[PDB]
Point group: C2
């Protein structure tokens, strides 16, 4: 599918789709796992795999892409959904440098 | 100045400018007062005066425009600044209908 962009719209439609039809919720996090997810989406939906970044730790890793509603919570981490993320751009609040 | 749009960028630059050089902070709210502010900005900076809407009450009136960081708190209200507004689109969280 046409190489498209990761807009806030996309980030939710997709963020949503992963909850209502999938076991990402809870699933322990690993770089390799993220990559197959990232590579998959990129092929399935078409978004270039470089948007799924989280804040640097320690603690909770808030997504850098507003709209994407999944943070990584406890360094063993899990894919924890959270919809106040679809409205609160936490990661920008904490790390304004990144934006 | 060229009739421009009220983008999140503008909404803060402007939202900021009002704190660091003005007594809007606290000032009791009235429709008429808002209007002279709205009409002024529109002339000064150039933004068509129809962006400064807040949520319907009771209670706190969160701005409908993300970026604009001023809510109306207590029905006598005041122009109360708040920067977690530049990151949290509260009004969309509460009233998803409006968006």
């Amino acid at each position: 599918v046409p190489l498209r962009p990761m807009t806030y719209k996309a980030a939710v439609d997709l963020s949503h789709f992963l909850k209502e039809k999938g076991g990402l919720e809870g699933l322990i996090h690993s770089q390799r796992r993220q990559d197959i997810l990232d590579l998959w989406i990129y092929h399935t939906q078409g978004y270039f795999p470089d948007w799924q970044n989280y804040t640097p730790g320690p603690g909770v890793r808030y997504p850098l892409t507003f709209g994407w509603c999944y943070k990584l919570v406890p360094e063993v981490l899990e894919w924890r959904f959270d919809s106040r993320l679809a409205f609160h751009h936490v990661a920008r609040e904490l790390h304004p440098e990144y934006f």
